[PDB]
Amino acid sequence: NNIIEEFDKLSDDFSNDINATKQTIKDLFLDIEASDDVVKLLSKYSFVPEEKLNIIDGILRSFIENNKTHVINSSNAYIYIQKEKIKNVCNFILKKLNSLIQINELNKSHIILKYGKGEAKKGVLESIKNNDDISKNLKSELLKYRVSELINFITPIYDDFIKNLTDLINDLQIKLKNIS
């Protein structure tokens, strides 16, 4: 009976984590928007990743609700094991998302360096200078650092980001089906 409450907890926790991720990515975009014409463009760009995360959040919540039915008349084994499986899927999604966040953190820094000029926000140069996680090659190429050009630069990066979010949604729908 409280089992339904526990599944509800799965949904709610997942929603919280997803909203946190959403805020992180929004912070990426906001940090990039420093720096009136390109700003509106980036703010437009920032709406699609939020939509993708709202999909992931909603797909999981929809799955759990429709799976409550199977939980009431099944063995305790199925309940505990299934709960475990759902937790695993959620953790998978969150791990992939966090990896994606790291990737686009480096992408953000790259964008700020190549175009934007804080230069207080372009104190990314010190973070790049101290970054021991990137190759010295990339470091070298980066420390050397109008609109149609910016579009030309961020279009592959942004399209790849949304593509990764789109395939992640596909992975989620596949993994949920395997336990559906």
Author numbering: 48 to 82, 88 to 197, 206 to 240
Article excerpt on this structure:
Two proteins from P. berghei, a rodent-infecting parasite, have been identified to be essential for host cell traversal by sporozoites. These are PbSPECT1 and PbSPECT2 (sporozoite microneme protein essential for cell traversal). No pore formation or host cell membrane wounding is seen in the absence of either of these proteins. In contrast to PbSPECT2, PbSPECT1 (∼25 kDa) has no detectable primary sequence homology to proteins of known structure or function.
